[PDB]
Amino acid sequence: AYEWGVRSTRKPEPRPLDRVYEIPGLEPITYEGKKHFVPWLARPIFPPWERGWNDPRFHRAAPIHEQTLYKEEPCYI
Amino acid sequence: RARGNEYQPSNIKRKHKHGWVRRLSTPAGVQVILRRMLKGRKSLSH
Amino acid sequence: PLHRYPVHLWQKLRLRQGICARLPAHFLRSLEEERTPTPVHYKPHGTKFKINPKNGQRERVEDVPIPVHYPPESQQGLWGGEGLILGYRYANNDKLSKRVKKVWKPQLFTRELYSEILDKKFTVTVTMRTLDLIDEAYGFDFYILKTPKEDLGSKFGMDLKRGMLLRLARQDPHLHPENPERRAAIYDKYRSFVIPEAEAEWVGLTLEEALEKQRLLEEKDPVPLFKVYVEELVQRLQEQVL
Amino acid sequence: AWRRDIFGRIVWHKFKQWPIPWYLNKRYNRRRFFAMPYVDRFIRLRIEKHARIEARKRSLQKKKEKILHAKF
Amino acid sequence: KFVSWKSRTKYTVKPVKMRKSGGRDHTGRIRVHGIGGGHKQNYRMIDFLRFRPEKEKAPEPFEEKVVVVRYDPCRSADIALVAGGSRKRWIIATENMKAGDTILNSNHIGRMAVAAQEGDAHPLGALPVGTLINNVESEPGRGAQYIRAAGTCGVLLRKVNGTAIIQLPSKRQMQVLESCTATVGRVSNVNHNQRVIGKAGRNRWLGKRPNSGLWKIRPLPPMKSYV
Amino acid sequence: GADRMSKWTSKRGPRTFTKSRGAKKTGIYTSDRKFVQIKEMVPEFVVPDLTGFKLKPYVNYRAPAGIDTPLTAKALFQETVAPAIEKDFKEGTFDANNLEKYGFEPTQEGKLFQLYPKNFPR
RNA sequence: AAUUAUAUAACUUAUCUAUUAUAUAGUAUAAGUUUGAAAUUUCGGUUGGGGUGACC
RNA sequence: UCUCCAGGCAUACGCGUAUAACAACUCGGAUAACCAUUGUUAGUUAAUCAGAAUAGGCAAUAAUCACACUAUAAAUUACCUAUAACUUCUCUGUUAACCCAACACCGGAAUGCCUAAAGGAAAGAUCCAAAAAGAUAAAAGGAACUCGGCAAACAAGAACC
RNA sequence: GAGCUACCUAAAAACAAUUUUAUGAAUCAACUCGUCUAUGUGGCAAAAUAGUGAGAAGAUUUUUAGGUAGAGGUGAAAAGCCU
Numbered sequence A: 001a002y003e004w005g006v007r008s009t010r011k012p013e014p015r016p017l018d019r020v021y022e023i024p025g026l027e028p029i030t031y032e033g034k035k036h037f038v039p040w041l042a043r044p045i046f047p048p049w050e051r052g053w054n055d056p057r058f059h060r061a062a063p064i065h066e067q068t069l070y071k072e073e074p075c076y077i
Numbered sequence B: 001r002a003r004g005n006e007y008q009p010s011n012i013k014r015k016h017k018h019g020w021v022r023r024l025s026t027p028a029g030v031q032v033i034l035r036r037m038l039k040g041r042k043s044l045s046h
Numbered sequence C: 001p002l003h004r005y006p007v008h009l010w011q012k013l014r015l016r017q018g019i020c021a022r023l024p025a026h027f028l029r030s031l032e033e034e035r036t037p038t039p040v041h042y043k044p045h046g047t048k049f050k051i052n053p054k055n056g057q058r059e060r061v062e063d064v065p066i067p068v069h070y071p072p073e074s075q076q077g078l079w080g081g082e083g084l085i086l087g088y089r090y091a092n093n094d095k096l097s098k099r100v101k102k103v104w105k106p107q108l109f110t111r112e113l114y115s116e117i118l119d120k121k122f123t124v125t126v127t128m129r130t131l132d133l134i135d136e137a138y139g140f141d142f143y144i145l146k147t148p149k150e151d152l153g154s155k156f157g158m159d160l161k162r163g164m165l166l167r168l169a170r171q172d173p174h175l176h177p178e179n180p181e182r183r184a185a186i187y188d189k190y191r192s193f194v195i196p197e198a199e200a201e202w203v204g205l206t207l208e209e210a211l212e213k214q215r216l217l218e219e220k221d222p223v224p225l226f227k228v229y230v231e232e233l234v235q236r237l238q239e240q241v242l
Numbered sequence D: 001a002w003r004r005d006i007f008g009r010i011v012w013h014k015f016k017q018w019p020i021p022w023y024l025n026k027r028y029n030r031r032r033f034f035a036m037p038y039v040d041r042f043i044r045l046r047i048e049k050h051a052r053i054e055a056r057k058r059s060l061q062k063k064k065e066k067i068l069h070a071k072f
Numbered sequence E: 001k002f003v004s005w006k007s008r009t010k011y012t013v014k015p016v017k018m019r020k021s022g023g024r025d026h027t028g029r030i031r032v033h034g035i036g037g038g039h040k041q042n043y044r045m046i047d048f049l050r051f052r053p054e055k056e057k058a059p060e061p062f063e064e065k066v067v068v069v070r071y072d073p074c075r076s077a078d079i080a081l082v083a084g085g086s087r088k089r090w091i092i093a094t095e096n097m098k099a100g101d102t103i104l105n106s107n108h109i110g111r112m113a114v115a116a117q118e119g120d121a122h123p124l125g126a127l128p129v130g131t132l133i134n135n136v137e138s139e140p141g142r143g144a145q146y147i148r149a150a151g152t153c154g155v156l157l158r159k160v161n162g163t164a165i166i167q168l169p170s171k172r173q174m175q176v177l178e179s180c181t182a183t184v185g186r187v188s189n190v191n192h193n194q195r196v197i198g199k200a201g202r203n204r205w206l207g208k209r210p211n212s213g214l215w216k217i218r219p220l221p222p223m224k225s226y227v
Numbered sequence F: 001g002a003d004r005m006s007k008w009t010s011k012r013g014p015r016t017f018t019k020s021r022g023a024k025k026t027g028i029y030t031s032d033r034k035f036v037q038i039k040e041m042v043p044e045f046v047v048p049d050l051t052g053f054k055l056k057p058y059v060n061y062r063a064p065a066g067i068d069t070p071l072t073a074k075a076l077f078q079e080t081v082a083p084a085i086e087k088d089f090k091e092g093t094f095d096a097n098n099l100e101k102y103g104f105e106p107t108q109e110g111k112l113f114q115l116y117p118k119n120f121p122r
Numbered sequence G: 001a002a003u004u005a006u007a008u009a010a011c012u013u014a015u016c017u018a019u020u021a022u023a024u025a026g027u028a029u030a031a032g033u034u035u036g037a038a039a040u041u042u043c044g045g046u047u048g049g050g051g052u053g054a055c056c
Numbered sequence H: 001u002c003u004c005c006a007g008g009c010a011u012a013c014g015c016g017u018a019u020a021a022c023a024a025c026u027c028g029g030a031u032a033a034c035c036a037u038u039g040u041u042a043g044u045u046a047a048u049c050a051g052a053a054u055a056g057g058c059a060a061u062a063a064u065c066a067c068a069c070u071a072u073a074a075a076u077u078a079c080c081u082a083u084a085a086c087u088u089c090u091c092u093g094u095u096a097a098c099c100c101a102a103c104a105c106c107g108g109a110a111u112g113c114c115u116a117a118a119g120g121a122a123a124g125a126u127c128c129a130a131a132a133a134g135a136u137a138a139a140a141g142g143a144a145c146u147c148g149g150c151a152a153a154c155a156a157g158a159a160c161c
Numbered sequence I: 001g002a003g004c005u006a007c008c009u010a011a012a013a014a015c016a017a018u019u020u021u022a023u024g025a026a027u028c029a030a031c032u033c034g035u036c037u038a039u040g041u042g043g044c045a046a047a048a049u050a051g052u053g054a055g056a057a058g059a060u061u062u063u064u065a066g067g068u069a070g071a072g073g074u075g076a077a078a079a080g081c082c083u
């Protein structure tokens, strides 16, 4: 069951979330207001970003299954 | 052999070894700049 | 030349000028005060006097705490005041032998602990001392609330205190929802620690975190001077009409 | 905005126009607006260096007025 | 700055370009001496899990066709391209494998012994005691790790209950479950041990830097006047 | 022996090193290295008609100069906004909500020329 | 050579878990023992000069 | 115009105005002429030379005139499936006798083309002493020299530890 | 501090003519090296010059960028090399 791809070359897992987030009812203090990273404040969580319009140079396609021409039956080309 | 010509100039090598971006990469290099700023050097880095 | 103030007073003068001055008075008191943590790695002298055996006379005794190194990994767990003792030893326990570097390390375990006020179970790095303190305090929630910052010695622990204090202060109905009776019992059990809402918010904040909080609170975009002059003109016109 | 650089000084930072928000730019996040503690000694050395210059500057003006008063 | 070249996640039969180490590790320091230079090479992704059913197919014995038996720069043995269904995968070739041969890959654990034909992959339980085997896996599903060199064949000494004993080429006896899959036959290039390097330059073609030129029982007290 | 004091420019270094002299970009580089100039990105010089213009580069030495009174927000507000509000207040047709009537803009978004952040050059 | 040596390696007793009928397992640590990668320090005196001896 | 010598022209890397004209004649060239020096003014022009959209699927078959021919050290974005956009020329490198060796250093310095059509000057004037360095010739002899055939030779062959 | 040097990684280059063969083969350029003698000895040169020599399709040579750092690195061991 040898698996290709040595672990060192894989993208690293996201850093563990700050423990202040675990505590319920507590509003973390993060560096969002400063608009830059600092090591001694908590890391913000941002919602997904939407440009509000389509920029042709940075178009990103939908996944395979969401394509209009997706068909479950396979076609051999 | 004749010595004295150990310097083979190369701008790519120079800016990579002693440049601004290189000095800021590690905290010890940042302190190299801090010393030179305190001394008053006109050239902080290559 | 000379500085006007001794260097040890510089931190106090910094807290007393600028945005630091505008920070809450109660919060500054926690910053200002320094209290020795309860002894952990040394035996304190029971008395203030002892009888010297060699000369048989009474001489004063004082407690000098050992220097203990607290790795940053400790701030993400609940060590009960324990830390690393970085010191030296004498080989063979004779001072005429070589002096050797020695480090004494705490025995760390991973344990899962339940907080009633938060109604959540946390997995924490802990020492056997920390478990004993909780037992002596008759509850995990009692341990965090009773223990002071200096004894607690953990940023994770201090954040737990703020959440618990904030939970009690607001009587948040988010605890065990649909069970007011069960909730009521929990809040009643810990009623001794209830404090005003404003104070509880600033509990356990570091100086940098406190400063960012204060900056956010007073952050405000400028008022278009069109409105400001309009207010002045209306007031003058209204006053003249009076 | 007013920001502190990696050398421990307070400098006004002029903003730039970008098409993406700051938390998504990777060229912006390499820039550091904080100083690590190893800068603290250098912060004090600047204050003491500046204090020496100003003290010398005051002393000289006092000496110069003595020359004026003796001359006039 | 050392980034390992072994960064390809997906299996392919296309040869993959290798970056050489030089005996140095990610730190940049020599960890093994005597490795350096040599000929440039390409890595052909071998597949040592013989019974890998094709995607979206049932788990039962299948057959594959041998396209070509080829020289491999990266190992002592030789490799065989094998095709079955819609899949091509490199595999290690046995002593007698030729192009156009057919080789079975069986999951069924024969209650009785199954006649052994070289090149077919069978669980150790199926094979009879004494059969020469190669490409043995320690645990079911792991993949072959032992007896993978040229002309190296181990024997299956014994089978009792759910486990069997394997005599590795070093004569070291190992024990594995009878469910483990072992290929039959020798591993090919049996004469690899007969090869002669001849000239010092040939080892410098295989990436073998020269050896360096640098040229314990404490007596007990009662036996120190006799040392 | 390299010169540490002179400015780093594109004339120095190997061919691969290139950098600009401060000229603003006017286009985009697509893949396969095609430059696409954008018409809107190229500045347009708005020049007025100077026919019948009475003002020339220099002024009479006989012309009296004026006392400097740099413009202030109060002076601008009094000259422009005070006359309307004062008259309207007497008429009683005044409220805080309708400050736009006198020229106030609650937000700069949507305007071609925004006063902050400035989005137009001199 | 003298003094050390949580370099690696091993065991032993605790500590902490699992289990089990007391018991065999493991182990973010402490205390021992064994091994010794290393570290620190030194090179008494008198004897045409060098072996050994000797002598103080 | 004559006499004679025989690595030159490009690019890369590097250097950073040493480029060219004029005017100067202090400093710099190890001296003069003249300028490589000082001051002033100029210069290197490029859509071809040179530099700087997204997501999936998949690869057995070297090179060497690549045919034959064997071989061993086993060896270089494409093509498809969908999505998106639906007429564009700005920016920068461009000079020289040049760089690394404290110097206008008998040294070091990658590649392509070519070998004199390109590029150059060994002698400031005079004098022909010793000693010193180099080249050429040698009556008769031919290692007698010398630690040793070192160096040289109209020699450069043969053998043995 | 590895622009010298030691070793390495990646991407690139160069090898005419002649004879053997099918090559760490031969003669001999370019190129790499530095055997012996003389000159030089503050020299043209902090290791050169002039001759004479060794290799010259390979464990060859060269170019560019990267790596390993002093309790260390590198070493076909000379305690060599690391401006």
Ligand SMILES: [Mg+2]
Binding pocket: B004, B006
């Ligand atoms: Mg030098």
Ligand SMILES: [Mg+2]
Binding pocket: B008
């Ligand atoms: Mg070089």
Ligand SMILES: [Mg+2]
Binding pocket: E212, E213, E214, E215
């Ligand atoms: Mg040996």
Ligand SMILES: [Mg+2]
Binding pocket: none
């Ligand atoms: Mg000129």
Ligand SMILES: [Mg+2]
Binding pocket: none
């Ligand atoms: Mg002139």
Ligand SMILES: [Mg+2]
Binding pocket: none
């Ligand atoms: Mg000039």
Ligand SMILES: [Mg+2]
Binding pocket: none
């Ligand atoms: Mg081009």
Ligand SMILES: [Mg+2]
Binding pocket: none
């Ligand atoms: Mg030119």
Ligand SMILES: [Mg+2]
Binding pocket: H105
């Ligand atoms: Mg000279």
Ligand SMILES: [Mg+2]
Binding pocket: H119
């Ligand atoms: Mg000519």
Ligand SMILES: [Mg+2]
Binding pocket: H122
């Ligand atoms: Mg001449």
Ligand SMILES: [Mg+2]
Binding pocket: H123
């Ligand atoms: Mg003459």
Ligand SMILES: [Mg+2]
Binding pocket: none
């Ligand atoms: Mg002669």
Ligand SMILES: [Mg+2]
Binding pocket: H138
């Ligand atoms: Mg003669």
Ligand SMILES: [Mg+2]
Binding pocket: none
């Ligand atoms: Mg004689």
Ligand SMILES: [Mg+2]
Binding pocket: none
């Ligand atoms: Mg003789």
